Amino acid sequence: ALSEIETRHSEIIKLENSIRELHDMFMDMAMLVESQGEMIDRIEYNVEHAVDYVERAVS
Amino acid sequence: LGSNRRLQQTQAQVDEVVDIMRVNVDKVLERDQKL
Amino acid sequence: RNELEEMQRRADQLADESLESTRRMLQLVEESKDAGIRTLVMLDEQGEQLDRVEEGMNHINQDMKEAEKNLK
Amino acid sequence: GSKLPDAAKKMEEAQEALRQAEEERKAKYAKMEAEREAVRQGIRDKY
Amino acid sequence: GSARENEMDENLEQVSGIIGNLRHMALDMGNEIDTQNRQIDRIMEKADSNKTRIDEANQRAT
């Protein structure tokens, strides 16, 4: 009974480590992507000015 | 026990997901370097 | 004897730690879901942004051919 | 009555503010990429 | 014991199901990013092409 629970417990910990690392990746992904999203906002704002300037010049 | 089989699956299931996320990290890092 | 007591006490000890491990796992997985969902929302919203950016690039291209051809 | 070097003074002073806001754009974006590649390579070497 | 087994195995099964959802989310992200990566490469080429044309058109015009 003890030897089985012992070996089972070990596999639980293995599973914990994986999930933990997986979780950390998911978090890093979100933060990293969120950061990138803000750089894109800039590029969009920047381009939209350039486009308006070009359109105004033709007119 | 039967519960060891049940557990063993999850272990392998998570391992897959990790490798998938890993590739996703690779891609987002490439996405970062382009922006 | 305290020998019985304590090898038994260990059994319960280990079992309890396993329980609390699964408790953790549950919260970690749920939090990863929030993270996942969040990420998808941002990516989708950024999708609309990028599409409008490329539309901007196409508009500029149109105005180059129109400005050159017309006001030459 | 005409007392207007004060125009000239505060004019120049604005532009000094504008020229050092250029150096805020320049310096603080230099260290922006600094802290971005730090974050990159950091994440790289942990995975 | 088996009240421990009950709750423990309940959590396990609950986790496995949710892990299934993570798999689905992971793949969606993969595809989403791939699509956006290509889009960024096209925007880089279009921007560069437009900048070359604007340099020429401006320079020649005035």
Swiss-Prot record, chain A:
Belongs to the syntaxin family. GO terms for molecular function: ATP-dependent protein binding; calcium channel inhibitor activity; calcium-dependent protein binding; chloride channel inhibitor activity; identical protein binding; kinase binding; myosin binding; myosin head/neck binding. The lineage of its organism: Eukaryota, Metazoa, Chordata, Craniata, Vertebrata. The keyword Phosphoprotein applies. This is Syntaxin-1A. Residues 2-59 form the t-SNARE coiled-coil homology domain. Expressed predominantly in cerebral cortex, hippocampus, cerebellum, adrenal medulla and retina with weak expression detected in non-neuronal tissues. Keywords: Cell membrane, Coiled coil, Cytoplasmic vesicle, Exocytosis, Isopeptide bond, Membrane, Neurotransmitter transport, Phosphoprotein, Synapse, Synaptosome, Transmembrane, Transmembrane helix, Transport, Ubl conjugation. One of its GO terms (cellular component) is neuron projection. Its main location: membrane. One of its GO terms (biological process) is positive regulation of norepinephrine secretion. It comes from Rattus norvegicus. It is found in: Cytoplasmic vesicle, Secretory vesicle, Synaptic vesicle membrane; Cell membrane; Synapse, Synaptosome. Phosphorylated by CK2. (Microbial infection) Targeted and hydrolyzed by C.botulinum neurotoxin type C (BoNT/C), which hydrolyzes the 253-Lys-|-Ala-254 bond. Cleavage inhibits neurotransmitter release.
From Swiss-Prot, chain B:
Keywords: Acetylation, Cell membrane, Coiled coil, Cytoplasmic vesicle, Disease variant, Intellectual disability, Membrane, Phosphoprotein, Synapse, Transmembrane, Transmembrane helix. Changing E16A: 70% reduction in cleavage by C.botulinum neurotoxin type F (BoNT/F, botF). It comes from the Eukaryota. The record marks Q33, K34 as: (Microbial infection) Cleavage. Its main location: membrane. Nervous system and skeletal muscle. Belongs to the synaptobrevin family. GO terms for cellular component: clathrin-coated endocytic vesicle membrane; clathrin-coated vesicle; clathrin-sculpted gamma-aminobutyric acid transport vesicle membrane; clathrin-sculpted glutamate transport vesicle membrane; clathrin-sculpted monoamine transport vesicle membrane; cytoplasmic vesicle; cytosol; intracellular membrane-bounded organelle. Coiled coil: none annotated. One of its GO terms (biological process) is positive regulation of intracellular protein transport. The gene is VAMP2. It is linked to Neurodevelopmental disorder with hypotonia and autistic features with or without hyperkinetic movements: An autosomal dominant disorder characterized by axial hypotonia apparent at birth, global developmental delay, intellectual disability, seizures, and autistic features. Involuntary hyperkinetic movements are present in some patients. Changing V25D: 65% reduction in cleavage by BoNT/F. This is Vesicle-associated membrane protein 2. One of its GO terms (molecular function) is SNARE binding. It is found in: Cytoplasmic vesicle, Secretory vesicle, Synaptic vesicle membrane; Cell membrane. The chain holds residues 28 to 60 of 116 of the full protein. The keyword Cell membrane applies.
Curated annotation (Swiss-Prot), chain C:
Keywords: Cell membrane, Coiled coil, Congenital myasthenic syndrome, Cytoplasm, Disease variant, Intellectual disability, Lipoprotein, Membrane, Palmitate, Phosphoprotein, Repeat, Synapse, Synaptosome. The keyword Chloroplast does not apply. It is found in: Cytoplasm, Perinuclear region; Cell membrane; Synapse, Synaptosome; Photoreceptor inner segment. Residues 1-13 have a biased composition (Basic and acidic residues). GO terms for biological process: associative learning; chemical synaptic transmission; exocytosis; locomotory behavior; long-term synaptic potentiation; neurotransmitter uptake; presynaptic dense core vesicle exocytosis; regulation of insulin secretion. Neurons of the neocortex, hippocampus, piriform cortex, anterior thalamic nuclei, pontine nuclei, and granule cells of the cerebellum. Its main location: cytoplasm. Residues 12-72 form the t-SNARE coiled-coil homology domain. Residues 1-68 are annotated as: Interaction with CENPF. Palmitoylated. One of its GO terms (cellular component) is cell cortex. The keyword Repeat applies. GO terms for molecular function: calcium-dependent protein binding; lipid binding; SNAP receptor activity; syntaxin-1 binding; voltage-gated potassium channel activity. Residues 1-16 are annotated as: Disordered. Belongs to the SNAP-25 family. This is Synaptosomal-associated protein 25. It comes from Homo sapiens. The chain holds residues 8 to 79 of 206 of the full protein.
UniProtKB/Swiss-Prot annotation, chain D:
Residues 3-37 have a biased composition (Basic and acidic residues). Residues 25-47 are annotated as: Interaction with the SNARE complex. Positively regulates a late step in exocytosis of various cytoplasmic vesicles, such as synaptic vesicles and other secretory vesicles. Organizes the SNAREs into a cross-linked zigzag topology that, when interposed between the vesicle and plasma membranes, is incompatible with fusion, thereby preventing SNAREs from releasing neurotransmitters until an action potential arrives at the synapse. Also involved in glucose-induced secretion of insulin by pancreatic beta-cells. Essential for motor behavior. This is Complexin-1. It is linked to Developmental and epileptic encephalopathy 63: A form of epileptic encephalopathy, a heterogeneous group of severe early-onset epilepsies characterized by refractory seizures, neurodevelopmental impairment, and poor prognosis. Development is normal prior to seizure onset, after which cognitive and motor delays become apparent. DEE63 is an autosomal recessive disease with onset in infancy. Binds to the SNARE core complex containing SNAP25, VAMP2 and STX1A. It comes from Homo sapiens (Human). It is found in: Cytoplasm, Cytosol; Perikaryon; Presynapse. Residues 6-46 form a coiled coil. Belongs to the complexin/synaphin family. Nervous system. In hippocampus and cerebellum, expressed mainly by inhibitory neurons. Overexpressed in substantia nigra from patients with Parkinson disease.
